[PDB]
Amino acid sequence: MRSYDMNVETAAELSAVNDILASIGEPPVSTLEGDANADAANARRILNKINRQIQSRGWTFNIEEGITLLPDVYSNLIVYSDDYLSLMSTSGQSIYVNRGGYVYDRTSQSDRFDSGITVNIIRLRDYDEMPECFRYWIVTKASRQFNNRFFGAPEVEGVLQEEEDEARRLCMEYEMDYGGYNMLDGDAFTSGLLTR
């Protein structure tokens, strides 16, 4: 699992942590570098956990379709990184699983590939790379879980529950606007049915 605390702090990640800290009434921190601040370290850990969780759900902007994963030419192994939040087939039933940290074809019972496989994959991205609406939802959900675990204030719980629902709604609006899905001509089955 990718280390969240081992790289440079971005402005957005520092802002995200300060937003999470504010949810229980903690004052903002100037830097994310270790100053023995347990609350900030707890906030960043939940921020990473929520960042992985919402990205793993799958969205049009973050689902990579038709990606080729290449094997090692001398070991014929394709690595299944822990940063692969979801690995699927491009169509039909999926056949690839994680076995020992490498891609495994469960139908053929083999982990050896002579050529790249084409998969529908979600790869973990930085919180900085998320759309603004998705960043807000991640922070809102992280703030809600942060308050639940380390403060537990019931009044804060109720408001953050409402804010997450609104934040998820606005991410749902982003998903459809980005998606541009059409059931007539953008549909896999119906589009063929419209030919006269």
């Binding site: 280390s3 290449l70 094997p71 090692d72 030419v73 001398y74 070991s75 192994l77």
Partner: protein
């Protein structure tokens, strides 16, 4: 057994993005070399790019027409130059302790994965030369 610090991919002449599975402390610790008739090492910012922390993007597409069948991604962590050096007056930090431990692990890991620089058993029961010449064999009998 299976090397995790050296990754080599087939060069098709049209793909320029290659995955980095292994951990690394610095982008300089990642060495990109094109293999073929010769082993040509690439430069950090003129021959390739770190598109993401796990992805290397070549500036130019290389293939058998260029004389390069494979591309190799290998971690070479510095042994003489440690990234973390503790001083008598310095606050001990979790990040500093993590980096010092991980660099030592990577140096040990690169040593344990040195079957690449020799003839070692691959996944099958075969000794693998990994696409290089056994020079100076000279006469045989």
């Amino acid at each position: 057994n299976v090397i995790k610090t050296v990754l080599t991919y087939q060069l098709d002449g049209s793909n320029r993005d290659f995955n980095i599975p292994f951990e690394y402390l610095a982008r300089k610790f990642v060495v990109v070399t094109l293999i073929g008739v010769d082993r040509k090492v690439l430069t950090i910012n003129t021959d390739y790019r770190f598109a993401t922390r796990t992805t290397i993007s070549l500036t130019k597409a290389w293939g058998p027409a260029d004389g390069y069948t494979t591309i190799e991604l290998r971690r070479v962590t510095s042994t003489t130059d440690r990234l973390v050096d503790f001083t008598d007056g310095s606050i001990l930090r979790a990040y500093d302790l993590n980096v010092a431990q991980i660099q030592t692990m990577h140096v040990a890991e690169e040593a344990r994965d040195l079957t690449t620089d020799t003839i070692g058993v691959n996944n099958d029961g075969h000794l693998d030369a990994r696409g290089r010449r056994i020079v100076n064999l000279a006469n045989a009998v």
